[PDB]
Design a protein around this ligand. Sequence first.
Ligand code: HEM
Ligand code: HEM
Ligand SMILES: C[C@H](O)[C@H](O)[C@H]1CNc2nc(N)[nH]c(=O)c2N1
Ligand SMILES: C[C@H](O)[C@H](O)[C@H]1CNc2nc(N)[nH]c(=O)c2N1
Lengths: 420, 420
Amino acid sequence: QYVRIKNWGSGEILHDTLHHKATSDFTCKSKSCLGSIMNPKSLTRGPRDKPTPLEELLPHAIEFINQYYGSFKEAKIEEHLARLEAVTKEIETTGTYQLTLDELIFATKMAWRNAPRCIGRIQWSNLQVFDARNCSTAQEMFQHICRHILYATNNGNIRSAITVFPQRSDGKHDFRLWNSQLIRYAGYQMPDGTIRGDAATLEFTQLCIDLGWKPRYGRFDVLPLVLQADGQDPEVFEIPPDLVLEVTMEHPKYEWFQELGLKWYALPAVANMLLEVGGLEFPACPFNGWYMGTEIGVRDFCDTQRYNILEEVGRRMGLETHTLASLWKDRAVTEINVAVLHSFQKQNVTIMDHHTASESFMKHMQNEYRARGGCPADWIWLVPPVSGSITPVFHQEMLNYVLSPFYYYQIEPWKTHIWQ
Amino acid sequence: QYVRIKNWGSGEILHDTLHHKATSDFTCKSKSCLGSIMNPKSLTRGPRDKPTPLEELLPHAIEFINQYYGSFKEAKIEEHLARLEAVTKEIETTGTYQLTLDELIFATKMAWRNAPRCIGRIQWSNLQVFDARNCSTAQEMFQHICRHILYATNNGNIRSAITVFPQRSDGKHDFRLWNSQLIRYAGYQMPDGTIRGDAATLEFTQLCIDLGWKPRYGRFDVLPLVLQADGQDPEVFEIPPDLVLEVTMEHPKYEWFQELGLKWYALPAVANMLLEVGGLEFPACPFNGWYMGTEIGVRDFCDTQRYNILEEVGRRMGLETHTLASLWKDRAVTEINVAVLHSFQKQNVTIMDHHTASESFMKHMQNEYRARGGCPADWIWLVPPVSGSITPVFHQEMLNYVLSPFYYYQIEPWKTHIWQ
Ligand code: HEM
Ligand code: HEM
Ligand SMILES: C[C@H](O)[C@H](O)[C@H]1CNc2nc(N)[nH]c(=O)c2N1
Ligand SMILES: C[C@H](O)[C@H](O)[C@H]1CNc2nc(N)[nH]c(=O)c2N1
């Protein structure tokens, strides 16, 4: 009927009626490249009630196994056949099937390798996999998560890793982390009308409060891990402060910068994503990489929907804040960016600047193209929020497409969960 | 078979074989959002041999006329009917038809209003139209172009305008400007292996040289207007230097900046685009707006494929050029940007900074959505090459789609022209 278009800044929504009057075929699509959309139904893998139908599951499984065994330099045909046989049988026996460890590993790397929105993909071969498939309780999830957060952090020398929880069974016994990302500050709507902390985590914070969380009312309060096992409702577990490594922000020239009382966690771990592989899907499998400066300096600190520090950092620099054309914003942000990179380097916490990051991705694309003849890339995401064309990936044409295995988005669990 | 992907920086080309292994349907498209592609066959309107078939032309014409007359606040039904009648008749009489002046005007504004890649669209109602449809010689084109360039420039107080040449007849009597844009510097590949001027205009410069152009071998040599009328071959006309208004670059603090010997033309006029409207198509109709700082400061001056000044402007600032992570690039560019904005403001030449530009577009989108229920927007193009997320349009979801009337791209005339 119409398309819902949201402006992530004002949160305002618009209804596009015009697209119906489109000509014929546009680029690969007919009447609209909705590539600009954040959460398209196409990048999401929702709920269930019934298991994955055998006729579908079987081929998908066979496909994935052909991918796996076709991988190794010198194919183990017998084992390839043997595995195909063993899987077909196991599928027609249980209704689902289990992956060998080396399969999940290969899976997870390929899924990452197939994530069109990730720029750190040149690191695809170096990934740690925590097999939590045999897990069964919320408490057990928590213990696994802590181990991950521990291993990942490694005292600043951040390590990429993913902890895969139990796969999907029927569709009502799902393990799901309700948080956006492993570590994430809270946002509270204060009495005097203002907002404190991360305004993005406002709705989620209230949820934590509703599940009886102790609101510490601050600017950098690490939110609690909201876990749900095998269908069972979400149990709230607080992350051990000793596990949350942070970096306090300080500029190499502007000493008044640390007076801002800014800091940010060192661990970027995406929590709420689903892993599809060979017909199987793991709705709980948090992964982490390492920060890329611009994420914190530009997005986290300078967005209106986030901490929104730009006005202040601009003022303390003595810039013409009431004159857009003075490019004070361009000046401030860059300094905030240097602050972050500096503060991370100083406190020996792994981080990469967007330029070095883009240059390594371009190299990756070449390796990827020469290797498998392609590389799914979402330009909109791959190009940094600042210094776009000063970066190589801006002048690079890309093809955005969904392969498999793949890391899909999911429906926020609190909207579709049946309470008990 | 495969898709050609070019990297506009190195000019290197890649062949994507992988997309064939795509899942099902992606966003609006099945196996690929090629929204990142520069010149998709979908945004191009190529050659011909035979006129526009009556069965197609007629409906399209009827459609456009329903759009036009449905426009005015209080419809002139009788004239609406009368015009529909007069057009149908005129079409079935000649094989093509002519638009009333007020129709071309309305057309041109709507076409602009429908350009998904333009950010200056809030100015759609203020546009000047030069009716050169009765033109017939290369020399006459030239005179019309000069008048345009004159009116547009207006001594720095730049005015948006478009000069529409003769529509398409059969498909072998086309009026086409071979230049990229009205005013544009030349690029020569010098003896010592280097490149001087705009490296982007290397192939076109050689063409001008082949058509006997006097190579002034410099960094800012305004290229000659290569015109072609009614099929006839391209006649080379040089633009009267008194018409080309330029702005010499100078920084408000760094006095060594003007020592760079930099400057740029004040007139942004797109030359090589085709105008489709009601089945009719005008392969020659140069239009112009006014510069948006970032175009010159970031694209023209800092691209590797262009003037490539970043290394130098960085060095003279005394920055750690051999250390990507020092964000010297971010620092330099911003200063170059201030230089441009400053130099234009100082010499009283209309220009707009990207922030003020984004804020006016967002306003436009709201006006557009409330008015007609939509606004074709190409995020990739609308978001500035620097300070992406510091701009409102970055956090704005858009729908990219081809409506009508519309400004399509064309095939570079020297590839498809039959010489005589
Ligand atoms: C080695 C370090 C890595 C770097 C520098 C890196 C960097 C990035 C960046 C900058 C983004 C965009 C984040 C945003 O704007 O929200 C991103 C997204 C993403 N990355 Fe990575 N990444 C790394 C490792 C990983 C790993 C190890 C995985 C998974 C195994 C991964 C999976 C993804 C996915 C699926 C997204 C999409 C996020 C979303 O859709 O919200 N990344 N990455
Ligand atoms: C009022 C001032 C205007 C401003 C500030 C403006 C600005 C812009 C900018 C920044 C671009 C991108 C240029 C590039 O990156 O190559 C653009 C593209 C475009 N604009 Fe405008 N514009 C203005 C007026 C116009 C007018 C008057 C027309 C036509 C009647 C127009 C038609 C278009 C079209 C078709 C494109 C696409 C260019 C391409 O595909 O290469 N613009 N505009
Ligand atoms: C509306 C628009 O798609 C959205 O704001 C985008 C654009 N590009 C992005 N790219 C990255 N890396 N991260 C993001 O959140 C976004 N958001
Ligand atoms: C490959 C990529 O599509 C290309 O470099 C783009 C991106 N966005 C752009 N946007 C604008 N305004 N101008 C451009 O030339 C480009 N080029």
